């Protein structure tokens, strides 16, 4: 739980940049949802980067 939590906090820091992370209720459910979202975003960002670079080449 401690690893997933770290991944979420890092991911939120990346998404919100220089803006202070908004306070939210940290419970088992909110963490799971955020974790799924973080995994999904990371996987999609990777895919979109590869597509964007290819389109430049094309």
């Amino acid at each position: 739980m401690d690893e997933k939590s770290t991944k979420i906090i890092m991911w939120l820091k990346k998404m919100f940049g220089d803006k202070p992370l908004p306070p939210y209720e940290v419970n088992t459910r909110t963490m799971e949802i955020l974790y799924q979202l973080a995994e999904w975003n990371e996987a999609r960002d990777k895919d979109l980067s590869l597509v964007t670079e290819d389109l430049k080449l094309k």
């Binding site: 590869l50 670079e53 290819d54 080449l57």
Partner: protein, 50 residues
């Protein structure tokens, strides 16, 4: 007679050199027909890697 023979040898030599250069060029592996596509993806093929 020496000058005339000398000119003929030079012409034949220049032609010979130019032929060797062209043959070397035509023997380049990249120009030679459809070698069966390579089984491995070339490092230069960025699209297939992506």
């Amino acid at each position: 007679v020496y000058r005339e023979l000398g000119s003929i040898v030079q012409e034949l030599k220049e032609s010979g050199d130019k032929l060797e250069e062209r043959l070397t060029m035509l023997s380049d592996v990249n120009l030679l027909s459809a070698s069966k596509p390579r089984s491995n993806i070339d490092s230069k093929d960025l699209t297939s890697h992506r």
